[PDB]
Amino acid sequence: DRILTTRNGHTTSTTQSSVGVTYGYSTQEDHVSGPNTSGLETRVVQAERFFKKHLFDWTPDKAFGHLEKLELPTDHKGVYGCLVDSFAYMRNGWDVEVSAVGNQFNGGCLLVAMVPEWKEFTPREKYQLTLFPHQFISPRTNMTAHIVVPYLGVNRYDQYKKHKPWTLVVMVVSPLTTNTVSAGQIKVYANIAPTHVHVAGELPSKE
């Protein structure tokens, strides 16, 4: 019933504490082949798979508004990372999964959102982050958020070393509460996987 199993490549993630999958803005991808690539683009499926990253430790001291961010893509030491150094242009979506594991005795709430064209938000703007593809994480209800977003931006293809369209954001909505039965803190991890990965301008070898 409430048990979801996500699979990207030869990697899977089975979440029992899931609310569902939120698809941001659209469920389809703008044609990966446009006039800016002159039909010289290709798809690299070997890169469409999960990679992990620890975001932060959610503690009782962090109040409302505490915000942590992770601009994508980040340094990747795998196949995807190899692509970034071998090609001038790339484009891809993101299958994001964020988990804050504690126990049913913890209280509190986290907002998990994917933001296009990140900009530092002011205290007041934070009250409206729900305008972006998001999902909440509350111990009593779920320990895993799951968001899926497509590629976008002014350009059909991008140079990730100069611009990062999507930015993962996690913000404390209501501080973590603890009992004598609860967990003391909750470590928030991210399980991310790039989607519909396409490369275009093959670069020379650096030697």
């Binding site: 019933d1 409430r2 048990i3 979801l4 199993t5 996500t6 699979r7 999958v21």
Partner: peptide, 6 residues
């Protein structure tokens, strides 16, 4: 068991 998002 449950749903799949392959």
């Amino acid at each position: 068991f449950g749903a799949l998002l392959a």
